[PDB]
Amino acid sequence: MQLRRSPGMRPMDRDWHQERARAREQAYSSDLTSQFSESEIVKYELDTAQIDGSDNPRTYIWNRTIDLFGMNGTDVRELRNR
Amino acid sequence: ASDEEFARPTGQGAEIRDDGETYTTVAWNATKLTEGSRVTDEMRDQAMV
Ligand SMILES: [Mg+2]
């Protein structure tokens, strides 16, 4: 018999997909302990997700202290030469 | 035209490097090939051909 949390069933669970996608968009680094609850790390097997901060939009968005030119909020991976 | 190449694997957010199509030529210099012959009018008359 298999439960939703059982190790062979995790890839069938819609939430395991959705929440691993969430986790990749949250992170700034691969250090899971700095960023995620220990429940999440086990429940969503976050060791096996390629979490590294490269998928987080905030990694690429400009956010300078003072902005006279409306530069803030631009995402560098949406420029002409990217 | 220059040969085909491969796209570079690139980091997220990193800018695109340029590697455009370069061009060259091969020249032709057409060389005048020539050929000539002369026959005397006495030979031109007397020949069966
Ligand atoms: Mg090249």
TrEMBL record, chain B:
Chain positions recorded as Mg(2+) 3 binding sites: F6, D19, E35
Binding site for Mg(2+) 2: E5, D19
Binding site for Mg(2+) 4: E15
Any coiled-coil regions, as ranges: none
Name of this protein: HK97 gp5-like major capsid protein
Taxonomic lineage of the native organism: Viruses, Duplodnaviria, Heunggongvirae, Uroviricota, Caudoviricetes
Full protein stretch here: 150 to 198 of 396
